[PDB]
Paper text:
It functions as a ~4 MDa complex containing its cofactor dynactin and a cargo-specific coiled-coil adaptor.
[name] binds DLIChelix using its RILP Homology 1 ([name]) domain. In our structure, [name] residues 24-185, containing the [name] domain and ~18 nm long LZI coiled coil, bind along the cleft between the dynein tails and dynactin. This was resolved in both DDJ1-185 and DDJ1-560 structures. The [name] domain docks above the dynein-B1 tail and shows extra density consistent with two copies of DLIChelix, one on each side. Distance constraints make it likely that one DLIChelix comes from dynein-A and the other from dynein-B. The LZI coiled coil is sandwiched between the dynein-A2 and B1 tails. The interactions made by the [name] domain and LZI are sufficient to promote dynein motility since the JIP31-185 construct only contains those regions and can activate dynein in motility assays. A [name] fragment containing just the [name] domain and LZI coiled coil but lacking the Spindly motif is sufficient for activation.
Author numbering:
A (entry chain F), G (entry chain E): 429 to 441
B (entry chain f): 705 to 923, 985 to 1040
C (entry chain C): 23 to 128
D (entry chain j): 353 to 373
E (entry chain m): 424 to 485, 513 to 704
F (entry chain B): 24 to 128
């Protein structure tokens, strides 16, 4: 469940 | 001999023993109910000899009373396990239908495996007997119903080679087969689309043979192939409603019958060569 | 811990709002709010998973209560049926053995 | 799908459950 | 009874403690109120079925035959009522037995009279729908086993008609909602197609429940365990499993 | 009543919401209010339902244990009564037929 | 729970 928005974040890094 | 043997019913209700069966190299181990027939004959003998004026010991009468107060669950368990073994042998006779009743076999095996933990003197023995007997009777009648419909389905499939080449009789036969599959789908057997597709490949092969026969009998060309090519396909899960998708022409009619041509595409080349 | 459809749906709406707020202003909006949201989101799934266990335990133990009550009542009744047949057999065959005793005494 | 197990291995497992308890 | 059992336990454990002071020991007890207890048991086992018959009779039998039946029911209850049933004496017991026999003969005569009042069904009902309606109106008379046994040649035809309707609705559900004309007629009446499908399946389920109500009415109580009702109930259950609308709603929500 | 874990996580998102409101503008959370109050109300209501289920669970488990024990004692009494009955049966019939062979003598 | 975030918002708008 934590993976979803972590991916949300790492899009531009 | 009875006071030497020391009968009595205890332990859990089921019993898994292993016997060496002739015709099978390994031992085949079976399921039996922990209630010996010697207990029942002892109950009959105690009820018989007591009226005869023959004095029986107190432990023998105690065992007989404990047996007679535990008999109605035991006979029902014996009947259920014998019906289950008979029906499992009946479905093992025809290997073509094993995947159709996997759900019922799973349910009955789950009810057996739950029931293997129950001791004879447990309080839970009253509703478990009724539930097991109801489930086993339902499983047996479902198996017999499917045996009858599978025999009829095999008859209707084998009647397709002797059916005359016209759209009306082909449509009627496929309508009967679709209605039988509808009857299968109403009672919700397991693995229905896989078995329906396995039927559908065989019926597409048979229709390819019949299309080959009609094409070499042709040797208005377009009208003769629409007799087979516009036949409606067999739909497994047709009872569902609501999904607003449309099946394509390949999955609605037998539009791949030319690929199922047993002599390759050369019969279509031989048909077009005469024009 | 299997996620339900309802928690996945509202987490999808949270994902929508978080993508909208990321696109609208900057990255720095989400960087402390999403760890304070994801633990609550895990807590929703945890409390639903515990609640369904509570429900199935309630149903099985309830039906075991109604099994116990009627089984005890039937067992009490069949103890009573043992306890007057004793009395009837007792005084009947005691009267017969007493009449046998006095007829053998004379 | 649905694939109920073979009866033999199933009731050997149940025989083990009979023996262990 | 329970206080007497506890006291009898006390007499047992005192007489086994008083063996050397007693030579003869019997337990002959015949209490005088047990015959009274049997009298009130028989009085409830009259009054319960009398109330059950009489409430139904004054409820649903609203011809001079019906007035004759209710007057004979009142006459039977008054003929039993005029006899003092509280007497445990022998002459009162025989008067009670005679009143019971007279009440039973009157009730059986009334039962056969209303059976003949119910056997004119073919001479009245020319179509199965009004026979359905009069069978629904007079349903509570079929708790009696004689009335239930009297109607057997109608029940088979009614079951066959219901089975034909169930098969017809099965062929209605054989086509799907996109191929149906109902989708077109809902779209021309400004119904969105998801909600139109939900509506269509719910009205099919409502018709199925109405036919289940009809077969419950025709076969009386315990219809699910009947010879013909078992297949009907099983197929109704299996059809209602396929008529739910939760998954399409969930897919629309997704 | 508001539960304390939901109150603490609520305070966490309250200070986070204050940070985002003071940091950029007032439209940061204008589309975030009825989502987050629904999520917190969901957690509170399901936890309250769990709280009801726990106490009714402990009540029915307790009198379940009591009913099991009293039914086991009733089993013991019933079996003892049947054994006493069949023993008294055999003993009295035994000396009764000893009396009638004494009669036939 | 509405009132509290409501205050959050109107406290300075």
């Amino acid at each position: 469940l934590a993976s979803f928005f972590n991916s949300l974040l790492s899009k531009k890094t | 001999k009875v006071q030497q043997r020391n009968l009595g019913v205890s332990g859990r209700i089921f019993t898994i023993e292993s016997t060496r069966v002739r015709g099978r190299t390994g031992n085949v181990l079976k399921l039996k109910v922990n209630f010996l027939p010697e207990i029942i004959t002892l109950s009959k003998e105690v009820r018989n000899l007591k009226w005869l004026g023959f004095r029986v010991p107190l432990a023998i009468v105690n065992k007989a009373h404990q047996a007679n107060q535990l008999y109605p669950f035991a006979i029902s368990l014996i009947e259920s396990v014998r019906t289950y073994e008979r029906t499992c042998e009946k479905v093992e006779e025809r290997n073509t239908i094993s995947l159709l009743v996997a759900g019922l076999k799973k349910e009955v095996q789950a009810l057996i495996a739950e029931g293997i933990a129950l001791v004879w003197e447990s309080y839970k023995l009253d509703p478990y007997v009724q539930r097991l007997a109801e489930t086993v009777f339902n499983f047996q009648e479902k198996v017999d119903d499917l045996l009858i419909i599978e025999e009829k389905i095999d008859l209707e499939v084998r009647s397709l080679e002797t059916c005359m080449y016209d759209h009306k009789t082909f449509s009627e036969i496929l309508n009967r087969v679709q209605k039988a599959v509808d009857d299968l789908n109403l009672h919700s057997y397991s693995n229905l689309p896989i078995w329906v597709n396995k039927l559908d490949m065989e019926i597409e092969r048979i229709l390819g043979v019949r299309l080959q026969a009609g094409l070499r009998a042709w040797t208005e060309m377009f009208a003769w192939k629409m007799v087979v090519l516009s036949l409606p396909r067999i739909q497994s899960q047709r009872y569902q409603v609501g999904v607003h998708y449309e099946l394509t022409e390949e999955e609605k009619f037998y539009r791949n019958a030319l690929t199922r041509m047993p002599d390759g595409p050369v019969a279509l080349e031989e048909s077009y060569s005469a024009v | 811990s299997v996620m339900s459809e309802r928690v996945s749906g509202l987490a999808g709406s949270i994902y929508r709002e978080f993508e909208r707020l990321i696109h609208c202003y900057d990255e720095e909006v989400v960087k402390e709010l999403m760890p304070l949201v994801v633990n609550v989101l895990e807590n929703l799934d945890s409390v639903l998973s515990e609640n369904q266990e509570h429900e199935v335990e309630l149903e099985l133990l309830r039906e075991d209560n109604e099994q116990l009550l009627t089984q005890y009542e039937r067992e009490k009744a069949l103890r009573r049926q043992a306890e007057e047949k004793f009395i009837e057999f007792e005084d009947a065959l005691e009267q017969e053995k007493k009449e046998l005793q006095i007829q053998v005494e004379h | 799908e649905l694939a109920a197990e073979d009866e033999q291995v199933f009731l050997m497992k149940q025989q083990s459950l009979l023996a262990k308890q | 009874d329970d206080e007497y059992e506890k006291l009898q336990v006390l007499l047992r454990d005192i007489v086994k403690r008083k063996r050397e002071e007693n030579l003869k020991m019997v337990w002959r007890i015949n209490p005088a109120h047990r015959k009274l207890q049997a009298r009130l048991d028989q009085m409830r086992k009259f009054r319960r079925q009398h109330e059950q018959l009489r409430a139904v009779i004054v409820r649903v039998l609203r011809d001079a035959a019906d007035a004759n039946a209710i007057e004979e029911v009142n006459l039977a209850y008054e003929n039993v009522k005029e006899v003092d049933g509280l007497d445990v004496s022998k002459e009162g017991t025989e008067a009670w037995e005679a009143a019971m026999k007279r009440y039973d003969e009157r009730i059986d005569r009334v039962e056969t009279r209303i059976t003949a009042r119910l056997r004119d069904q073919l001479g009245t009902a020319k179509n199965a729908n009004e026979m359905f309606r009069i069978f629904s109106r007079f349903n509570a008379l079929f708790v009696r086993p004689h009335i239930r046994g009297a109607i057997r040649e109608y029940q088979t035809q009614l079951i066959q008609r219901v089975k034909d309707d169930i098969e017809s609705l099965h062929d209605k559900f054989k086509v799907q909602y996109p191929q149906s004309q109902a989708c077109k007629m809902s779209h021309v009446r400004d119904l969105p197609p998801v909600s139109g499908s939900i509506i269509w399946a719910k009205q099919i389920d409502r018709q199925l429940t109405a036919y289940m109500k009809r077969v419950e009415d025709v076969l009386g109580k315990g219809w699910e365990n009947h010879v013909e009702g078992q297949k009907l109930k099983q197929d109704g259950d299996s059809f209602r499993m396929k008529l739910n609308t939760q998954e399409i709603f969930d897919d629309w929500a997704r």
